[PDB]
Amino acid sequence: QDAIQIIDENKHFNTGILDYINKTSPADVGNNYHIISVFGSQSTGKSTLLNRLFNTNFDVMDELNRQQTTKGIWLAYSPVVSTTLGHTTSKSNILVMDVEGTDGRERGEDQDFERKAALFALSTSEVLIINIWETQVGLYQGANMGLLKTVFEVNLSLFGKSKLETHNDHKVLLLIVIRDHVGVTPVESLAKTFTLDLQNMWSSLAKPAELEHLQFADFFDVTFHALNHKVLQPKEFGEGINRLGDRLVVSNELFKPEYHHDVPIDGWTMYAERCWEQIETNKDLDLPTQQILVAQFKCDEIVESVFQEFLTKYQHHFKEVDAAPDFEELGALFADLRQDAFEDYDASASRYNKAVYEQKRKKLRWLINDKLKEVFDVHAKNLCNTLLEKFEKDLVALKGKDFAVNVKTLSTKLVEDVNFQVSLMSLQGDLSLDEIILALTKDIDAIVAKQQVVELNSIVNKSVKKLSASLSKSIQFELGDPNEETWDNVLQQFKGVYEKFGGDFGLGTSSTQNQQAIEKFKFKSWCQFYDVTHKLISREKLLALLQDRFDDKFRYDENGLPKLYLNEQDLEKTFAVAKQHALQVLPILTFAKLADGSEIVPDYDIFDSKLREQFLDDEEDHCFAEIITEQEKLEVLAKFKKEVDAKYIETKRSIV
Amino acid sequence: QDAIQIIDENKHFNTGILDYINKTSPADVGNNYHIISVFGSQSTGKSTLLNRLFNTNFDVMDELNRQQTTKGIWLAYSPVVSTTLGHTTSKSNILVMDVEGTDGRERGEDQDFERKAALFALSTSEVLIINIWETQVGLYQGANMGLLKTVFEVNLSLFGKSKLETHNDHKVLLLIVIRDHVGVTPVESLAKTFTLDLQNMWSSLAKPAELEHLQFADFFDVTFHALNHKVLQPKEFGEGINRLGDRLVVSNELFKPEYHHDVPIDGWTMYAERCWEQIETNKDLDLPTQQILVAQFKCDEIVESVFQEFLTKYQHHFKEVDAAPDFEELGALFADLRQDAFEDYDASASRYNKAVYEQKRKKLRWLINDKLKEVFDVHAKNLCNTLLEKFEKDLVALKGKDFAVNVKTLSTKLVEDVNFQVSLMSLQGDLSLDEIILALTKDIDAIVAKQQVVELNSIVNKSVKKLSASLSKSIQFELGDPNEETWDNVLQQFKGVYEKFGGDFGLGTSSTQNQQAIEKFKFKSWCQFYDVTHKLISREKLLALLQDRFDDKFRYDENGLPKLYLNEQDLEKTFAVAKQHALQVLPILTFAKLADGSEIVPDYDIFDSKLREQFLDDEEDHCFAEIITEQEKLEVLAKFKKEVDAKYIETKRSIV
Ligand SMILES: Nc1nc2c(ncn2[C@@H]2O[C@H](COP(=O)(O)OP(=O)(O)NP(=O)(O)O)[C@@H](O)[C@H]2O)c(=O)[nH]1
Ligand SMILES: Nc1nc2c(ncn2[C@@H]2O[C@H](COP(=O)(O)OP(=O)(O)NP(=O)(O)O)[C@@H](O)[C@H]2O)c(=O)[nH]1
Ligand SMILES: [Mg+2]
Ligand SMILES: [Mg+2]
């Protein structure tokens, strides 16, 4: 017949509870019992009253030292209820829970466990006695109104939902008993106060909106019972209790079915543990206490001040973007700014909790790093764009001079360059270079790519100038001796240097495109080839072509000698030599051919402007090798004679 | 003989205090008085005890309703001190201050004014009575230990410094009187508790480091006096008081000189007001109360959770940089992310204070804007670089085609382009474009500047090709008739087109440099001029120059006829015609001149490589107009005859 702690100081809900309850009462407890408990400030004579109203045996404080006595929560079976008729047994089994008192000492700061044990009780009991001293009544934290708001609050947030399902719910009785009541002030007056206090507490709690409509009466009954001074009025104490004894068993006005959640005790013993789990570790209840709470707000106050003492002192160094930047001047002046602030902050918050102080210092640190990274980022990008120009120039300055072997060194040295120059400002690596260096590389590789296409096309364009050169030249040089083997010693160079285009670049491959450097090149050659022809040999240069050959015999002789004539027989003999010596190369070059009497074709369908501007036409195809149209063709031999026979009989004047 | 409120409820320190004090005591108060005051929880019978120990007339609560009675702070002059000898006058004037009680109701939440009035008292009084009920003793906020820590704390922070200057300081008496003391528990036991409580309170307060060494005893004396129940033990109440009456006047063990800060009352009446100002509005004291404090931490808890429910849900959409970006896909998916979070946060904190809830919602907003601006900034820059390439190409594609009139439209349309394309993502302008658009312009103006120099130099380079052209041509065309007026019809074009260089550009000025486009140009002409000469006319082309003229008579006749000879007289007559018809242009062109027989000079000191590569030499200056050196000069007339007289008598073979 000793009690047990359902829950011990350090929160362990108890196993043998169900067991225990049954081993006390010889009867079978069914849906036949009540659950009653006590709440209040430490040493208000709670255990005392449970021992005296029911007839339990909890421990009470011996009056030698005013100290905490109940620890955790306890449960006992009431043998009998003290009443005016003396001792009385009851119908139902009355199970009583004695809670450790709220407040004072020992646990003076951390109201963790008092918020919790209170709520357990509030949540598990049909009747809750709120045991206050009459003198605490008009008080706030004296009346405990602060640990109340909360419990009732987390109560509603946590179990308020279970309603509207209609029982036989937890309506619960708030049976608020005033202690050491002298009598001067009528309990009815005390009652009006503490209910108003309870009503007030109610409009105050935070309420999930489904229940924003819910009132305190909906969840809760209140009633009051005053006791006289136990020490100075011992008789009128005992009678006051008795009177309360009668209240709950005799009158039977106190327990009602609304509070009994209506299932057998094993049910309750499980329902408690469930509520206990949900309670023991709640978020809403999980709270650091004041010192901390208040050291948070205090340090946040100091930050905004020290930081606003930082801002407009930076609106001043940096409202103007520095004209003459130095990265040692900057980085150092950064440190200084941030030094100033720390000490000032530290001269105001090294008082408070270290951890909070510390946490709120790092908050300050990074508030200012971020205002410094704006500035640093500006000059970081200015430096880069500048440095990047040089570099681009640098690449251009070198002009095909072993590209990739110069991409390596210069690009390397630039990245290195910034990573040194900037890091002088990174405040100890506080400010990062990672994203800058990254954005550099990207801008680097952007350049080479665009300068690579320029070195790629310059290489082609200057490969088509040591080709239109030795090409358009050995067109003529061979032509001082019209041969079977003209084109034999012409394409055997037109293709002796046509091939050595690829592999010589030195740049960096763009390998498929390194490959496509050629199919512009070869298309271009196959287009200058035709352009040399249609320019080197046309109507005009054609009419001329006669005398070029015509006159190295028609008027010179033997060993480079001007031809000395004899009879009209040595004059009328070296004239028909010319009537063919005017026509004897043309068969080699009427439509330009090879050495095998077959037509020359272009590698591409060209005159078509749909293949044209991939590299920058009549009926059949204004033929490729058609140097001269069939009509301008003999518009040369409509003037073969006009001037050549103007020289045979027209210079027959001499022999005269 | 009524009291006055030195300070009223709403903090107004009182003017007529000094006045008042003197009008009570008929004697002159000098350094002859004490200042005594009371502190404690509401309705602990404080005013009652001041009325009874001194013999004042403060108001007391009528016992009908338990409510607040003292408002603000009051001061009265004690007529006499109740003692065991009855009523007793004292030597010094005893001035008593009655404070409104701490806690409960009315002002239930805001402990602003109770922190303050307490401190005033703590700071201004030689003796402070801490009036607690015996039952509050082992309590915490019951014993008021919470408003204590603070006051003592802000006390030390605010006046602790004034020490070490050695007086006659404010040591102050903590005269702590226990009320309704039944007797069961020995006051000496109660005393040990509440001093330990006071000592504890002391190690707890935040202490500026100069005073980190300071103890509670250094600043403070404590002593205790218990009173019996006033209502139930009226006699033993009165005797208890008396006993205390004796304590302070008779025994005279209670006031001591250490507490009296030792200056005339007018001094005190000023010293109070000073302390009052410093107190009335203190930062350290300025505190919002719990509800708020606790709604701050609660919402911060929710942020980190809703935000960490945001982060790694973004580590997931954006760990990969999107391959196929769409700015409507993005901006919308941004909104969504931020929508999710708000509602979740709002489903957890719409409970708490709006303002805090609201403030901590904007904190959440911008926490996520900043994680979204990273992403947005990436795609913002990708889009730009791309768009910028096209643009650069675009500029190149146009090639001198009315530059500035095309800078206008394209640049305009690009800026517009991004400002539309990006703004689709700016979440309602939440994310700013200001810095992007700015960085665009800079990159735009960087391009034109670099492409302007390319159009500037291409213009020059292609202005020096319609010059080396019609120039190097009308060198010869004139030369088919060597004249007095050769150079008259040569520079009158060499300078007929030399001038029309500037004003035709169309680009955009770079006006001083638009001007400097020319001084490359004119230096280049003054360098191709010499290069045409030293190439068009040199040792080789020279040897040749003879026959060019030599053969249009030495062998042709009259009307383009090959010269029919007669006697050796018509053969030995048109030979000396050539001995000068080989030399008759040279006087026009030995050193190349004008029409006035004076030397031609270059506009610049040229062969010098120190003026050279601003645009890309013997003894005197390897003379400018020195087409041929004095030695190669007649190395032409060491071969004038070698071949020309090889044709006069060498082709005397014919007439044979
Ligand atoms: N003046 C007075 N004293 C009382 C009254 N009731 C009990 N006491 C005494 O006050 C002390 C309180 O002991 P107890 O009843 O154990 O207090 P409690 O509420 O259990 N506090 P806790 O368990 O939190 O430590 C006891 O010594 C008891 O004798 C009362 O109504 N008036
Ligand atoms: N039981 C008890 N009652 C007391 C005692 N002293 C005074 N009272 C009664 O308690 C009530 C307190 O009134 P008062 O003395 O004005 O209280 P107070 O400390 O001025 N509070 P406040 O001024 O803050 O409103 C009075 O009605 C008085 O009769 C005491 O020692 N024990
Ligand atoms: Mg107990
Ligand atoms: Mg009062």
Secondary structure string (H, E, C) spanning A464-505:
CCCCHHHHHHHHHHHHCCCCCCCHHHCHHHHCCCCCCCCCCC
How does DSSP assign B482-534, residue by residue? --SSTGGGTHHHHTTSSSTTTT---S---HHHHHHTHHHHHHHHHHHHHHHHH
- Give just the sign of the alpha carbon dihedral B55, B58, B61, B63: positive
Q: Closest by alpha carbon to A98, among A23, A10, A3? A: A3
Residues 6 or more apart whose Cβ sits within 8 Å of residue A595? A484, A485, A487, A488
Q: What does each C-alpha distance from B204 to A351, A559, B566 come to in angstroms? A: 11, 129, 143
Amino acid at A358: E
Q: How far apart are CA B311 and CA B371, in angstroms?
A: 8
Ligand lying closest to the C-alpha of residue A229: 1
Amino acid at A441: T
Domain ends where: B410, B427, B461? B461
Is B172 a member of any domain? Answer: yes
Going by the annotation, the residues of the binding site of A for GTP are: 40-47
Nearest 10 degrees: CA dihedral of B101, B105, B106, B108?
A: 90
Full strand arrangement of the beta sheet holding A4-7 = A4-7, A73-77, A93-99, A33-39, A127-133, A172-179, A220-226
What residue has token string 């003879």?
Answer: B546
Is B466 a member of any domain? Answer: no
- H-assigned helices in A350-466: 354-398, 403-421, 434-461
DSSP 8-state secondary structure symbol assigned to residue A138:
T
Residue A33 forms beta bridges with which residues?
A93
Mind telling me how many Å the CA of A180 is from chain B's nearest CA? 11
Q: How far apart are CA A651 and CA A572, in angstroms?
A: 12
- The two tokens of residue A159 are 């179990």
Q: Closest by alpha carbon to A128, among A52, A40, A210? A: A40
Domain ends where: A229, A247, A280? A280
Check whether residue B83 and residue B165 sit in a common domain. yes
CA B581 to chain centre: 87
Residues 6 or more apart whose Cβ sits within 8 Å of residue A66? A43, B137, B138, B185, B189, B190, B193
Angle at B448 between CA B442 and CA B451, to 5 degrees: 140
- The two tokens of residue B594 are 């004008």
The three-state secondary structure class of B601 is coil
Q: Closest by alpha carbon to A128, among A40, A47, A39? A: A39
DSSP 8-state secondary structure symbol assigned to residue A209:
G
Q: Measured between beta carbons, which residues in chain A are less than 8 angstroms from residue B233?
A: 232
List the single residue in B with minimal CA-CA distance to A655.
B564
Max Cα-Cα span within chain B: 184
* 8 A C-beta contact, residue A501 and residue A514: no
Is A627 a member of any domain? Answer: yes
The three-state secondary structure class of B52 is helix
- The two tokens of residue B79 are 């007529």
CB of B98 shorter than 6 A to ligand 2: no
Residues 6 or more apart whose Cβ sits within 8 Å of residue A540? none
Check whether residue A312 and residue A246 sit in a common domain. no
- The two tokens of residue A352 are 């408070």
Residues 6 or more apart whose Cβ sits within 8 Å of residue B146? A141, A290, B140
Mind telling me how many Å the CA of A156 is from chain B's nearest CA? 12
B206–A352: do the CB atoms touch at under 8 Å?
Answer: yes
| Rg, chain B, Cα only | 56
Q: How far apart are CA B416 and CA B401, in angstroms?
A: 23
Q: What does each C-alpha distance from B30 to A103, A352, B97, B262, B276 come to in angstroms? A: 46, 43, 18, 10, 22
Tell me how crowded residue A442 is: count the other CB atoms within 10 A of its CB. Answer: 13
| Interval between CA A47 and ligand 3 midpoint (Å) | 4
Residue B111 forms beta bridges with which residues?
none
Is A493 a member of any domain? Answer: no
Residue B380, exposed/middle/buried by CB under 10 A (0-12, 13-18, 19+)?
buried
- The two tokens of residue B387 are 């768009």
Residues 6 or more apart whose Cβ sits within 8 Å of residue B43? A135, A138, B61, B66, B67, B68, B69, B101, B104
Residue B561 forms beta bridges with which residues?
B557
Mind telling me how many Å the CA of A429 is from chain B's nearest CA? 20
Q: How far apart are CA A193 and CA A411, in angstroms?
A: 83
Q: How far apart are CA A501 and CA A463, in angstroms?
A: 7
User: What SS3 string covers B188-229?
Assistant: HHHHHHHHHHHHHHHHHCCCCHHHCCCCHHHHEEEEEEECCC
Max Cα-Cα span within chain A: 184
Total number of domains in chain B: 2
Q: How far apart are CA B417 and CA B405, in angstroms?
A: 19
Is A469 a member of any domain? Answer: no
Q: How far apart are CA B330 and CA B335, in angstroms?
A: 9
Omega before B168 cis (within 30°)? yes
CB of A47 shorter than 6 A to ligand 1: yes
- The two tokens of residue A230 are 């136990």
Length of chain A: 656
Backbone angles phi, psi at A420, to 5 degrees: -110, -55
Check whether residue B229 and residue B359 sit in a common domain. no
Q: How far apart are CA A98 and CA A36, in angstroms?
A: 9
Domain ends where: B461, B496, B518? B461
Q: Record the resolution, in angstroms.
A: 2.9
Residue with the smallest CA separation from ligand 1 atom 30 is A230
Of B190, B293, B294, the CB nearest to A66: B190
* 8 A C-beta contact, residue B138 and residue A105: yes
Q: How far apart are CA A108 and CA A131, in angstroms?
A: 20
Residues 6 or more apart whose Cβ sits within 8 Å of residue A574? A553, A554, A563
Residues 6 or more apart whose Cβ sits within 8 Å of residue B314? B337, B371, B372, B375
Q: Measured between beta carbons, which residues in chain A are less than 8 angstroms from residue B209?
A: 350
List the single residue in A with minimal CA-CA distance to B228.
A232
Residue A209, exposed/middle/buried by CB under 10 A (0-12, 13-18, 19+)?
exposed
Check whether residue A297 and residue A197 sit in a common domain. no
Residue with the smallest CA separation from ligand 1 atom 28 is A45
A141–B184: do the CB atoms touch at under 8 Å?
Answer: no
Of B63, B105, B142, the CB nearest to A138: B105
Q: Measured between beta carbons, which residues in chain A are less than 8 angstroms from residue B66?
A: 137-138, 185, 189-190, 193
Check whether residue B249 and residue B371 sit in a common domain. no
Q: How far apart are CA B84 and CA A201, in angstroms?
A: 47
* 8 A C-beta contact, residue A553 and residue A563: yes
Is B274 a member of any domain? Answer: yes
Q: How far apart are the first and last CA of chain B?
A: 171
Q: Closest by alpha carbon to B515, among B503, B500, B524? A: B503
Check whether residue B123 and residue B174 sit in a common domain. yes
Run of H or E including A578: helix A576-581
Q: Closest by alpha carbon to B407, among B434, B462, B447? A: B447
Phi-psi category of A262—alpha, beta or left, where left has phi over 0 and alpha has psi -120 to 50? left
* 8 A C-beta contact, residue B293 and residue A297: yes
Residue B552 forms beta bridges with which residues?
none
For chain B, give the residues followed by a break (C–N over 2.5 Å): 616
The tally of CA atoms less than 13 A away on the side-chain side of residue B369 is 13
Q: Closest by alpha carbon to B288, among B158, B111, B103, B104? A: B111
* 8 A C-beta contact, residue B105 and residue A197: yes
Is A498 a member of any domain? Answer: no
Q: Closest by alpha carbon to A379, among A329, A336, A304, A450? A: A329
Residue with the smallest CA separation from ligand 1 atom 10 is A45
Q: Closest by alpha carbon to B586, among B613, B557, B549? A: B549
- The two tokens of residue A258 are 């609304």
Q: Measured between beta carbons, which residues in chain B are less than 8 angstroms from residue A294?
A: 287, 293
Check whether residue A297 and residue A423 sit in a common domain. yes
Check whether residue B298 and residue B276 sit in a common domain. no
Residue A589, exposed/middle/buried by CB under 10 A (0-12, 13-18, 19+)?
middle
| Interval between CA A42 and ligand 1 midpoint (Å) | 8
Check whether residue A43 and residue A151 sit in a common domain. yes
Q: Measured between beta carbons, which residues in chain B are less than 8 angstroms from residue A182?
A: 231-232
Check whether residue B110 and residue B258 sit in a common domain. yes
Mind telling me how many Å the CA of A195 is from chain B's nearest CA? 12
Q: How far apart are CA B314 and CA A653, in angstroms?
A: 105
- The two tokens of residue B64 are 């009908």
* 8 A C-beta contact, residue B538 and residue B628: yes
Q: Closest by alpha carbon to B96, among B48, B10, B38, B39? A: B38
DSSP strands (E only) in B120-216 = 127-133, 172-179
CB of B68 shorter than 6 A to ligand 2: yes
Residues 6 or more apart whose Cβ sits within 8 Å of residue B402? B506
For chain A, give the residues followed by a break (C–N over 2.5 Å): 616
Check whether residue A64 and residue A182 sit in a common domain. yes
Q: How far apart are CA A428 and CA A339, in angstroms?
A: 13
Atom of ligand 1 nearest to the CA of A179: 31
Is A467 a member of any domain? Answer: no
Residue B329, domain extent? 291-461
Q: Which CATH number covers residue A199?
A: 3.40.50.300
Look at strands A127-133 and A220-226 and give their pairing: unpaired
Check whether residue B267 and residue B297 sit in a common domain. no
